[PDB]
From Swiss-Prot:
Record text on subunit structure and interactions: Monomer.
Gene Ontology terms: biological process: cellulose catabolic process; xylan catabolic process
Subcellular location: Secreted
Keywords associated with the record: Carbohydrate metabolism, Cellulose degradation, Cleavage on pair of basic residues, Disulfide bond, Glycoprotein, Hydrolase, Polysaccharide degradation, Secreted, Serine esterase, Signal
A Pfam family of this chain: Cutinase
Enzyme superclass (EC): hydrolase
Gene: axe-2
Its job: Degrades acetylated xylans by cleaving acetyl side groups from the hetero-xylan backbone.
Protein name: Acetylxylan esterase 2
């Protein structure tokens, strides 16, 4: 059968297969909505290390965007009335960001600027949670956190996401990857810092 709610989680770089740090809000939704089900995005989650298959960051991102698109689009065709939630941490956030918001990822060589999710799938995506997304750029309506600058793959000024109202993207000032800070520790704690906020948001979008 099809569940009423299905969630997709995408892990950070070098994390072992599964959800990695997206687990905190993935698990939050599942336990908030018994009978809901979840799946991990299958993609390299790599930055050239041999442990994760040696793919470069650029190649990992390209493959991840396609992976998100394929898994979400196919699921939606199978379960068209199922509400979808996306959760992505760091690189996992960046691949969902492109897939859902379009605009490509010029720094990583992804040239296609089209939204990659189908129109049907975008409609049934009800909430998207990004944490530590290197495409972060302060000044977008869907962002929260203390970062007032942007990450190494930051969106350009004046960017707009058609699905802005379905998203929350979190990043603080001292983060070296989604912001221009220098405390890596910050990158690793968004789960405990914003998980509860994130869950409330998802809740308000789901009913």
């Amino acid at each position: 059968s099809c569940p009423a709610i299905h969630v997709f989680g995408a892990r950070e770089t070098t994390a072992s297969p599964g959800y990695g740090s997206s687990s905190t809000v993935v698990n939050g939704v599942l336990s908030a909505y018994p009978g809901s089900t979840a799946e991990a995005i299958n993609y390299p989650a790599c930055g050239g290390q041999s442990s994760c298959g040696g793919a470069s960051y650029s190649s990992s991102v390209a493959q991840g965007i396609a992976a998100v698109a394929s898994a979400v689009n196919s699921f939606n065709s199978q379960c068209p009335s199922t509400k979808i939630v996306l959760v992505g941490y760091s690189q996992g956030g960046e691949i969902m960001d492109v897939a859902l918001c379009g605009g490509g990822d010029p720094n990583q060589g992804y040239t296609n600027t089209a939204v990659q999710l189908s129109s049907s799938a975008v409609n049934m995506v009800k909430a998207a949670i990004f944490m530590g997304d290197p495409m972060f750029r302060a000044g977008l309506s869907y962002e929260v956190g203390t970062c007032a600058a942007g990450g190494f793959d930051q969106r350009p000024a004046g960017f707009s996401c058609p699905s802005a109202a379905k998203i929350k993207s979190y990043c603080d000032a001292s983060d070296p990857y989604c912001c221009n800070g220098s405390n890596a520790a910050t990158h690793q704690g968004y789960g405990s810092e914003y998980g509860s906020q994130a869950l409330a948001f998802v809740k308000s979008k789901l009913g």
